[PDB]
Ligand binder design. Sequence first.
Ligand SMILES: Oc1ccc2ccccc2c1O
Ligand SMILES: Oc1ccc2ccccc2c1O
Ligand SMILES: Oc1ccc2ccccc2c1O
Ligand SMILES: Oc1ccc2ccccc2c1O
Ligand SMILES: Oc1ccc2ccccc2c1O
Ligand SMILES: Oc1ccc2ccccc2c1O
Ligand SMILES: [Fe+2]
Ligand SMILES: [Fe+2]
Ligand SMILES: [Fe+2]
Ligand SMILES: [Fe+2]
Ligand SMILES: [Fe+2]
Ligand SMILES: [Fe+2]
Ligand SMILES: [Mg+2]
Ligand SMILES: [Mg+2]
Ligand SMILES: [Mg+2]
Ligand SMILES: [Mg+2]
Ligand SMILES: [Mg+2]
Ligand SMILES: [Mg+2]
Lengths: 293, 293, 293, 293, 293, 293
Amino acid sequence: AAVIELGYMGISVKDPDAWKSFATDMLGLQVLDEGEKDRFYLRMDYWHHRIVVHHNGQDDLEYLGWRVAGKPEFEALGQKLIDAGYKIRICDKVEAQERMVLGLMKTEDPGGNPTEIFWGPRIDMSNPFHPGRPLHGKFVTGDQGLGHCIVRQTDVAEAHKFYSLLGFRGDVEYRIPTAELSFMHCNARDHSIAFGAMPAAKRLNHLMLEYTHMEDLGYTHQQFVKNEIDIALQLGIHANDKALTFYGATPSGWLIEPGWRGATAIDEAEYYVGDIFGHGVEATGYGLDVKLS
Amino acid sequence: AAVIELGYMGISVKDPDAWKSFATDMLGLQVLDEGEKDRFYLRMDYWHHRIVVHHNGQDDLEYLGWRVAGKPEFEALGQKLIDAGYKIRICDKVEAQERMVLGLMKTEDPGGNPTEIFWGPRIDMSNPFHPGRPLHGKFVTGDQGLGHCIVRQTDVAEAHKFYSLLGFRGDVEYRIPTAELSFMHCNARDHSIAFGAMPAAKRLNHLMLEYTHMEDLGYTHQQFVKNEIDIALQLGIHANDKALTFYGATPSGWLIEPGWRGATAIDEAEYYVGDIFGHGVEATGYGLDVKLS
Amino acid sequence: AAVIELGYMGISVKDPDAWKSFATDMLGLQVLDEGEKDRFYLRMDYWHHRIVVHHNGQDDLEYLGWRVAGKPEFEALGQKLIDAGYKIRICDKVEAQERMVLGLMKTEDPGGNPTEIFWGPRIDMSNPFHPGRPLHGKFVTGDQGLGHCIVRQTDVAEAHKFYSLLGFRGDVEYRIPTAELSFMHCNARDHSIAFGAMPAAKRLNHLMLEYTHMEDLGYTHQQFVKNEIDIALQLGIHANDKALTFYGATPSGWLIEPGWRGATAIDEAEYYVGDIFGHGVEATGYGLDVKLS
Amino acid sequence: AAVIELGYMGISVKDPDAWKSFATDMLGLQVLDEGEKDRFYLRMDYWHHRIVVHHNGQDDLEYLGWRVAGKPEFEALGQKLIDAGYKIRICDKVEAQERMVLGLMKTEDPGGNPTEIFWGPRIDMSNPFHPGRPLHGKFVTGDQGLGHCIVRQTDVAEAHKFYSLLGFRGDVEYRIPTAELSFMHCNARDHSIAFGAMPAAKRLNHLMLEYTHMEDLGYTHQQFVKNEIDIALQLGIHANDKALTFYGATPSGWLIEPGWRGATAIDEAEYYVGDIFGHGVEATGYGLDVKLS
Amino acid sequence: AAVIELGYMGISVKDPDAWKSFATDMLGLQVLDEGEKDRFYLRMDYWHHRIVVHHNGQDDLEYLGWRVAGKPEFEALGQKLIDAGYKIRICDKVEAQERMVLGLMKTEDPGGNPTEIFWGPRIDMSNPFHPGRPLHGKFVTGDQGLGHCIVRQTDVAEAHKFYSLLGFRGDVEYRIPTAELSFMHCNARDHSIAFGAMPAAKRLNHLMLEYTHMEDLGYTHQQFVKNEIDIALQLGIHANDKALTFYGATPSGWLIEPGWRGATAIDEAEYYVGDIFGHGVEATGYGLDVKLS
Amino acid sequence: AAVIELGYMGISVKDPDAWKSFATDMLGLQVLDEGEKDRFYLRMDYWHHRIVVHHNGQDDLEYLGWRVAGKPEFEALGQKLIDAGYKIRICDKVEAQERMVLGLMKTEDPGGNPTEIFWGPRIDMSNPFHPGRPLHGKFVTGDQGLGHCIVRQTDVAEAHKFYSLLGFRGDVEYRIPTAELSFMHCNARDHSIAFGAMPAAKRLNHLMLEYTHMEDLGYTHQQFVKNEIDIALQLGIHANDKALTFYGATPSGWLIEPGWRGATAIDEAEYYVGDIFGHGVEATGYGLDVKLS
Ligand SMILES: Oc1ccc2ccccc2c1O
Ligand SMILES: Oc1ccc2ccccc2c1O
Ligand SMILES: Oc1ccc2ccccc2c1O
Ligand SMILES: Oc1ccc2ccccc2c1O
Ligand SMILES: Oc1ccc2ccccc2c1O
Ligand SMILES: Oc1ccc2ccccc2c1O
Ligand SMILES: [Fe+2]
Ligand SMILES: [Fe+2]
Ligand SMILES: [Fe+2]
Ligand SMILES: [Fe+2]
Ligand SMILES: [Fe+2]
Ligand SMILES: [Fe+2]
Ligand SMILES: [Mg+2]
Ligand SMILES: [Mg+2]
Ligand SMILES: [Mg+2]
Ligand SMILES: [Mg+2]
Ligand SMILES: [Mg+2]
Ligand SMILES: [Mg+2]
């Protein structure tokens, strides 16, 4: 029994209108508004949603939702967490329905990040993805889940223990002149969660979303430049996942990492002291002032 | 040890002559009459038969025959069922020979549906399938077994427990505005058995048979229309298996679901609130008045 | 730990000169004479040999040599046989060297057939196979071992227990109007050993050797016809392995089954009541007077 | 938990300048000098290095570095070695940093060869391999590690026990008229370590490095001939790995075996009494005066 | 008979030392100096050279060398040019040897650009490409020739007539708000020559060289940024060839266009009014101040 | 209409017994003796023969036999040769039958080498190739014909004109420090005929035969070394065809070039000044004292 993907994430925001325009125009995500007073959804694929956007918010992560294959794996992982001393709560039907899942449990990772484990997402096969702007392609999701994030941790060894229990694999992959960053995978995506020991004002450092087409990544980069949105780290290729990516500001102040061409996760641990090219610092103050080239 | 396919099914009918004409002309199945006073066979492939048609009957399912790989799996599953508290009977040679199998056991699922577990079907490699009408292609069988059915259940959780013990995987896949339907697989066929909590006059709701060719599905649909046979649900594509199918009346009053292009089963649970298109209700009273589009 | 192929076989013969001419001209095997007074070898591939031909003999099987992957599997299987009550003898270096293997043990199957289990065959990569007559192709060996045989058994259930312990899988595959024949596999070859309950004057009923090319099978058949050698069963295709084969007399009186186009073994048990075509009886008295078509 | 590749090796040399010229001109390896007073590095691929060359040395092997997938396998193998009675030392951060690995332990094989087990090599993805002379291709490394070696052993059975514990598989593959040589694999490379019982003045008999291109192997052979460097064994093809190789003197007196076209390791043990062609003795005194053709 | 590739080009430069450092460090080309007083060579592949760099020069193009398949095509094209009224000179052996070709003719295109047509380039298969800095990959050459250029033309219709006679195909592909640019191909490279009506101080506007690997393109871009070399047009993707490219200053003042992922030429004419993304103007004065996004 | 392969060759020899042993043991060719007093045949494949060996001979080439597709191409090429001023003779049935072809014409190339053009070779599909020694593989023939040769020419331009008329393509490919050698192809074999201006005592310089397997080439090389047969040029790889080959003496004094891994012919002319590696001179006096490395 193990987590198999980053299924969904919840964020809260102070400016929902800015977020709708940002998500659609700058990224190509689809806005779905179900008429709820306090939230809307962002789509990437056939799932009803991948991101829940809550308003009256704190401009930060609200929860990560990690999928397991089914009820037997849900029950086994729950018991594993209990046996290891972690505190979990199995949610009732109302709470599961709020997330639009068949089964749901809530806990917190060792860094304080609200963590949900679920099975049975709602897939709207009748409602194909329709991007918020014209796209050459689509997003890479499927068995790789929605993307990845770096989140704050206060104790890297304890974080690693928790994510290992959940079925993730990975360790320190960068020693940057020394800062150490750890990257963990639960499927073919090179990593789904990553972290280090750096102090951080927010739970969320960045969210990476992956395009199928280089043309969409480039156009997104151009949208950031034309609209004069801060780029924290310039275009570059990571040594671990081999993806072409950049990092730009969101209206909430944490970063989005649009990217293209991520490689398959490997179980064999290796480490690097820098990236392949690029990812030079441009705008500062976003929690990623590392020297990568 | 696990069930690996829906190997055969037995039905009983009040009008065997109507069933011969229906099976051959409307569906393209092959009638095999071995001169027995009380039954004949329907073929789909090289197996001696896939369906036994008993006459002097009740116009309903008589038994489902689930295959295991061999004697060791047969013996292991038998003991598993006994240990879990289910009542089984290991059949003698005469009874096994009646079904034309090397080993046979009989039991009943929690909904009262007679359930057989066997190994070693008779394959007539010398006698290739010869359809009851001209076909462009053939049927999809092989590792996927003969097809799938929905059968009546009175306790969904108990049904799920039983089929899980037998090696099936699956859960609720549709929440239709709320009706919940569960679908379970034991091989690459998207599902082989499915059920929900709806009251039903018959054990059998429908049997799905899959053509290799769209042209045969379309011609079958045309045969139903031309002969003015009730179509309960119109052409459409299911969100789970992605197959193009419709549902038509059989002479016994339960439905046949001829189809084409079923997708591979997945172990990762998801659910839907509707189909991709179609499957609108036409004729009523057949136990499937759900809103799928 | 399991047997992985029929590695070699030993036979003894009354007329070694006739056997050399037969093996080369009629079958295309390669004769290798190492100058030993009491034996010579037959080759099929890069192995030093696949068949040892002893002279001053009884015109029957002397031993079957079953390969395991290595020493750990050899030791594990030896202990398994001991624990189950079978009598084995681990051979010393001289005896292992006689067979040209790294490790050797000797036992007897429940029908009295001398049975050897070994690891580490001698492969003469420096000495490519050179057939005893011109061939269009070569033999099918590799992961499938040298071929298959039917051998005499006195207790089918005990035979099955023994071969199952050794890692073989399979059961009754033919019910011929009733005679039952069992076929067991230990690799991709449809079967490597088979048996039934019929009385037999010899340990060996037949040995099947498989050509890569239909042209070589046909030419071999023609050689039997032209030289007026008894054909016991005519050309035909088996329902289990789908191979085109015939059965002809050897100088020792047991049969050779030259063949072509054998299918991959399947773990799922099925049975047949006849072959696909052919295999009609021609010459009688060879222990295979079954009705296969 | 098992060793997955020969990750690195350390050697010590009396003439570092001769080694730089040899490695670059004769073999095409890349010299990397980090300004350390007592060592330099040789590269083959993206790894920071594959060979450490220590100076003020003994012209022999200093250590073999065997990789495991990650920390869990490192910890499991360490405990396995302890439980079996072997003496290991888990290294501190300074020592791990010396080797540029995330975790390191040191021990000695039963023949006295210093043996290191590590996880997390440093990969310089920013610094692609740049050969020390023009090459048509590159080296075969990746999942196959850097190459293979024969090292001295005093007790073959004890050596085999040790490498088996580490996850290697293999046994005697040559009986050369009798000398027995054992070859063990831990990945797809036909073998990564090999040994026999012959007396040897040095720990290291030879190191084999594999080119992707035959043209580079041939040019290397020509470089040895033109520069009048001793060739111990002439061009030939091995019966086990099917590679085209020759053996030439290094400035340290042990042999390099440049090669091309190695086959995939097999778990099924076989043995040979000679090679496919070539590998005739030319220069003597290098510890490989065997008759291979 | 037709031109099949841009085989070589000659340039002349005022600062050969700056060009050596630029070509090697910034681009990864290989410098080959044959000891000639007035020139050196740049390599990209197995050809003896692709670019001749003459010194005591004008910082501009000296000649384009267009390859034909062999002598029959050389002779046919020569006669075609003569028959159409163009002035050509068939070169003697000394002149052909200067270019290291088997046959050579010299002419001038309608814009005054010295144009050479040749067959039989010198290929140094013994001397594999060795880049002037470490590269992840190599260059795209082969059937696509060395790259492409834009050169000055004074009469677009006459230029088109000339290149059409030589076997090129293509027409106006961009109408940029109106400036019209024409692009012509002679092989699978999307184009090998292009031109428009804009006034130009130099014969050569830019030369495009294509990497096999995105990582090398990105590293080259980084080298331009780090060394503060003018980038005329920023990273972007062309609508015609779909390549990712940027344009940077050379020491001669004309531009290099390093790129990656060019698409196959198409014979069906289409046109665009802008690029896919990027190629925004940065540094001005380089003859490409067009609005492409 | 064009020649499509080197179909057969005739040689005459002073020592037929030495030639039988040489061809079989040293090369693996098959000797076929039809009981004719003055000749025997050598086979490589299903053709009745590829080489006719005449005795009472001159130890040189007697004729090259070039195949055309059929009668229409035979008639067209005959008329082409006549129209161009060459002297041909269309052979009668007896003469065609001597060569075992359906149609035959005889002429002489400009260097005096007897040249035959034919259609309709005799293929003995009933008699598969059986090599004169054990082989790992077979020969490369099929659409590539039997091999290639260098033959004497007195006027290279006239030779080129003749072979061009016959449908061959090619030109000078080596300028060896200056000696120029021309190589011409008529199918996918890199070349089938080659020549230069060097004086030669014999019509035939060498015949190249190509193995499918490197192992057979290496074993052949070893046979030459062990039997102390002159090797004129050592193992090496040609820059044009990329084949691994060496050149050894035949009993007739001209050379055989056994080889492996020839590349596909290219229509685009290029030239080289040396080989990739090897082909160093060993034994002299065989008409190939060129410097190739
Ligand atoms: O996705 C990533 C891969 C590698 C990284 C390496 C260092 C910082 C951030 C990184 C990141 O977001
Ligand atoms: O085969 C099926 C797939 C999905 C279904 C969904 C809802 C009702 C029946 C269904 C069915 O027969
Ligand atoms: O190889 C065989 C396959 C099937 C058989 C079925 C019945 C008798 C002999 C058989 C046999 O030798
Ligand atoms: O790599 C090798 C393969 C086989 C061998 C067989 C005998 C000696 C050395 C050998 C070797 O270095
Ligand atoms: O390679 C190119 C493709 C398209 C272009 C379109 C407009 C200007 C330059 C271009 C170029 O160099
Ligand atoms: O087959 C050949 C290819 C290239 C050659 C190049 C120079 C001499 C002989 C050659 C030859 O026999
Ligand atoms: Fe990231
Ligand atoms: Fe259904
Ligand atoms: Fe058989
Ligand atoms: Fe070796
Ligand atoms: Fe361009
Ligand atoms: Fe040649
Ligand atoms: Mg990772
Ligand atoms: Mg399902
Ligand atoms: Mg079987
Ligand atoms: Mg091995
Ligand atoms: Mg174009
Ligand atoms: Mg050529």
